[PDB]
Design a protein around this ligand. Sequence first.
Ligand SMILES: O=Cc1ccc(-c2cn([C@@H]3O[C@H](COP(=O)(O)OP(=O)(O)O[C@H]4O[C@H](CO)[C@H](O)[C@H](O)[C@H]4O)[C@@H](O)[C@H]3O)c(=O)[nH]c2=O)s1
Ligand SMILES: O=Cc1ccc(-c2cn([C@@H]3O[C@H](COP(=O)(O)OP(=O)(O)O[C@H]4O[C@H](CO)[C@H](O)[C@H](O)[C@H]4O)[C@@H](O)[C@H]3O)c(=O)[nH]c2=O)s1
Ligand SMILES: [Mn+2]
Ligand SMILES: [Mn+2]
Lengths: 274, 274
Amino acid sequence: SLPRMVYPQPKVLTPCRKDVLVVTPWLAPIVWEGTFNIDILNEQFRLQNTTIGLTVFAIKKYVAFLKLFLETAEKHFMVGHRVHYYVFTDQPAAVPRVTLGTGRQLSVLEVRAMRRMEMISDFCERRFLSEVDYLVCVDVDMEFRDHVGVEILTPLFGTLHPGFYGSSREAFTYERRPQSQAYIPKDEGDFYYGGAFFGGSVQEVQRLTRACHQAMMVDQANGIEAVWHDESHLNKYLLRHKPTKVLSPEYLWDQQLLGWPAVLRKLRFTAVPK
Amino acid sequence: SLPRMVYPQPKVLTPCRKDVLVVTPWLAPIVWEGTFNIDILNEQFRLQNTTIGLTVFAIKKYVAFLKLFLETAEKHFMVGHRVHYYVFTDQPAAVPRVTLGTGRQLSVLEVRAMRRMEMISDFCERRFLSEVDYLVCVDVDMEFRDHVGVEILTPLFGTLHPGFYGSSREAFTYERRPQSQAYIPKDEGDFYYGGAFFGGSVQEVQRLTRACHQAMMVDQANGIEAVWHDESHLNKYLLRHKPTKVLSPEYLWDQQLLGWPAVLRKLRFTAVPK
Ligand SMILES: O=Cc1ccc(-c2cn([C@@H]3O[C@H](COP(=O)(O)OP(=O)(O)O[C@H]4O[C@H](CO)[C@H](O)[C@H](O)[C@H]4O)[C@@H](O)[C@H]3O)c(=O)[nH]c2=O)s1
Ligand SMILES: O=Cc1ccc(-c2cn([C@@H]3O[C@H](COP(=O)(O)OP(=O)(O)O[C@H]4O[C@H](CO)[C@H](O)[C@H](O)[C@H]4O)[C@@H](O)[C@H]3O)c(=O)[nH]c2=O)s1
Ligand SMILES: [Mn+2]
Ligand SMILES: [Mn+2]
């Protein structure tokens, strides 16, 4: 139940974006700049006291990415909302000291030096259900450069991989061997989602990561490994279980490889040179 | 968990509609022809064994509208899904004999000759919670002329009133007297929703109808009646509790008064001369 708010009236006969698809054929929004009024969304999610968990793995050399990842998350990720970072690492002492805004906390979870799926679904199942409302699972070799907020939150979301958003499904690098659980035939597929940014309600993310982990274990027992590992299985899952929002490539970009095309009004979350 | 399906690939750089707004600023889809693949939606809702209740009031002379309303609903409303019609009338014997498709049933609920809100929220509360998953509440002086299906289903939806979809908020006929619970100031409002077609999950429709009934009772005690009765209160509710889908005027039209504009690719549910 929202309070009075003053903002520009949406106009039915004036689209927000005419250059891009803003809704999937199963009526999930595709989140692009211009499509949302973040003041309305912030109010809706604050009134539910929403807590967002962000999971990131930083094992071996990748601990070096945490400083920029976390500092930029503090500037751009869910600012104003409750956030709990979960950093999985084999080197807890290498986690940098980053000062956090109010309502935000960080937990370091030590692991031994694809298996992100198992860690999210099984080991942390009960903890996440009790501590957060949504989970966002990302790669660490990345930085936030602009707003990533509650516009992404929904029961289940995937993000368009920046290499494939303009490609036909035949060109998608899905697993194509029928022997793999991740198999998708050439005549199937909506989008190619990136492994580096997905999420949803805790319940839906636990279902996704459990399904992917089970599928990966089946492949392992059959002596096969999907072409792009967890990303192949994520794609098979999201083909069969449609996401309730799809994030545009504003949310998963690589400026070094792909520049800054006119269709991207903002570059929000981007790869860092490894 | 959907089975294999073969259908045209959505294309990120090819919008479905460039002439209209297809998502609200709070990321609810606006349902227009071309935006959805009904095969995907039908599969999703059938896999949940979805049952849709449709409520309609036909009191006094308006029983005369039931024959065309129900016959056309059989041709066009949720075909393939489980449907339960609830016909509220002061003349049960005037309800026409209409042959129903499989999986569809009709119950006649006798009432004595705005108060639709009370009937939906209070008297029928327990029955609807046990019998259906979604409720759709419509005017009876109407006929279906084209598909109205599970693309509309969502926790809470309203429909753009066909008289106002191109209007600025100042021209909306909201209640403007601060003395009424339905009051909306000239600088507020997203859309003008029609009283003749709204719905949602049973829980959300019961919340809406309870809130509107309570607000109407408060107005009554204060000696004020909102300018457009229940529709004024529906508009106040949906301003403060944003719908999770908005139906385009394809879903609530009057061809005699408004013709068949190019922006309407289908006229789905339309007024009948009274
Ligand atoms: O022997 C060389 C190494 C290669 C990774 C390492 C490795 C990886 N990671 C963790 O793992 C994340 C992803 O790794 P990358 O970011 O190197 O590869 P890419 O960007 O191609 O990844 C995509 O494709 C992937 C397919 O499996 C996934 O679907 C992934 O989600 C997709 O985005 C790191 O950000 C980090 O959190 C570590 O924490 N330590 C490591 O040593 S070391
Ligand atoms: O003394 C003359 C009568 C006027 C209605 C009657 C009356 C009404 N109804 C039931 O009520 C429905 C709506 O009635 P209308 O369809 O005549 O009026 P309108 O189209 O302007 O209605 C809009 O504006 C309305 C605002 O309150 C609502 O928000 C409504 O949802 C809006 O769409 C009938 O379809 C029927 O189910 C009856 O069942 N019996 C009756 O005698 S008799
Ligand atoms: Mn990466
Ligand atoms: Mn009417």
